Amino acid sequence: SGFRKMAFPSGKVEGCMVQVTCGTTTLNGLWLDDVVYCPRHVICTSEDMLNPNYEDLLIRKSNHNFLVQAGNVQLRVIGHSMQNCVLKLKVDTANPKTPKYKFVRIQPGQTFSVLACYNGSPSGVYQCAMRPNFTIKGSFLNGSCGSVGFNIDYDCVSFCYMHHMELPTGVHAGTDLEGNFYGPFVDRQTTQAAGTDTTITVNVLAWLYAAVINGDRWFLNRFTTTLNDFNLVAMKYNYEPLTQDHVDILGPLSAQTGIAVLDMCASLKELLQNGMNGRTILGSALLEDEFTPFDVVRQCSGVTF
Amino acid sequence: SGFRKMAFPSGKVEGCMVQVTCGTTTLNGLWLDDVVYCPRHVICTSEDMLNPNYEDLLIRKSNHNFLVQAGNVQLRVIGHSMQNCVLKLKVDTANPKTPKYKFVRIQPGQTFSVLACYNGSPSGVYQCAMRPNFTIKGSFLNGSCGSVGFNIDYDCVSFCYMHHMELPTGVHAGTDLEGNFYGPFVDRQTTQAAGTDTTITVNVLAWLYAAVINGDRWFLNRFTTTLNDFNLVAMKYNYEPLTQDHVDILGPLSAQTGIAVLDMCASLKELLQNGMNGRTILGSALLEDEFTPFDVVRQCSGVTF
């Protein structure tokens, strides 16, 4: 027992990280098979950054302008192209450590692990959720671009995220591995605003189930509610509306624990209206929304890779 | 910017995890060079577990009774011995993935990463602190024994923890890699109580520095205090006494931010006496004590491995 914010083991992704240098800009890339993926603004200089013409910068580049290093070793670049906000560099050597992988685009509310890297080297790993406003609450400094987010299913790495920018509020934005941004952001050196964020209701409920499983059960109350009545309260506290699909995906946890989903919703309503009165749940004084239902089951049942 | 509970990249440790089976008991082991380390109570069955005579059980075992598997491959056991609560199995093949490593015994308040494993396979990675009462607040189920905790410094893995048991209150206890428990616990199937725990004051202060660096500054007050006056308050709120060494190690953060250590202490005092009034710091509604000063600097400055 116990309940922690747990990341996936990072080893399979660690062996894919490289450094990509153009002019004096260095960022991280992802070496899979004979292709290296990285943010396209590696091709930017300090004068190009406010409103770059990436088509114009790229046509002028040559293969030999891109310095790709995998640890101590230079890779030879034999072709290049741009896909949305990502550059693809073809190199003459397939990565021998390439895992089984796929590229996925995740939905808001879904979770993934980030391997923060600098200069093609790992710094650390942590779990994130895609916020409803399409940001992530990450930890990234200068040089972190091209760090990736991922899930693992047995032996298959699903890459979902590549890091591009920090917004004013100190939250983070990036792309999928086809180079399309999550949210309405663009890769230019300019100020952009994340929308108002909301709390991921279905994850909060999943985590209340985790709490019950772990013996934290003080917040279970004597009430039930309806989806509609709960939603009146969710709108008030900036929670995502609960949908039928959400009720549905909480079904397994509900059956495991014998606590009906709408009874847990009633317990959540009371927590929102009454606060926590200085108490804690799973060691937190806030209601946690960065565990999905899948995450709770995985952790509470000990799934491995 | 941003500040997250960050684990070390787990790749170098993932390559060392194996499965060790005796009779019907399977737990995890750590394969370094030509030795496999695992909890000694792999040699227990259900009759032996309440008060095992490990000397008698081990003298009666032979090399061939221990089944060691790395992936789908059996390793051949060519010797065995016991050191405190750890069994050491000599095998005929040195682990080709052995990283640079050492064994360290850490002090209360220090942090490390856990790679939770089942059946010799990794499940997930998370950061823990050694609590003042020598427990850890982990996430471990049946089968997790022999999972290890570690720090990384450049290319060197310092192993500090091997998992052995869960205590009544849902916290966790284990040994260093020489098989000596942290705390007064023993490896027998019996109820044992952790002492009352206390908050790791120097870590709370480090995290308040992290907050200031990341722009969270509302709690900075207009007061200073002394070590002795602060300690009067720490005793009251079950905080570890702050010592001169603690003040000392906060020096770099203090110089970076221009906020004197005792001024930060005075800010902490006010937070303890007044509470947070429903506000948050680095997205937490509690004062977080599982980041060391070292951790804050590493994360805020982008150190890599």
Ligand SMILES: *[C@@](O)(c1nc2ccccc2s1)[C@H](C[C@@H]1CCNC1=O)NC(=O)[C@H](CC(C)C)NC(=O)c1cc2c(OC)cccc2[nH]1
């Ligand atoms: C990433 O590491 C990159 N750095 C560079 C440097 C030169 C060329 C290309 C790149 S990509 C970097 C990651 C950031 C830094 C701090 N935390 C992070 O997560 N990303 C950027 O610096 C990014 C580059 C753009 C070309 C996309 N810009 C921003 O994150 C950014 C720019 C602004 C801004 O511009 C006027 C105003 C406010 C906020 C802001 N963030």
Ligand SMILES: *[C@@](O)(c1nc2ccccc2s1)[C@H](C[C@@H]1CCNC1=O)NC(=O)[C@H](CC(C)C)NC(=O)c1cc2c(OC)cccc2[nH]1
């Ligand atoms: C670990 O995976 C092991 N399992 C076995 C099974 C058979 C033989 C040896 C071992 S080691 C296991 C990890 C636990 C399970 C749940 N969460 C964990 O972290 N450790 C144990 O099960 C451990 C074995 C002892 C021989 C050291 N025992 C306990 O954790 C334990 C025993 C008691 C108890 O006994 C009467 C009362 C209360 C609490 C308790 N915990």
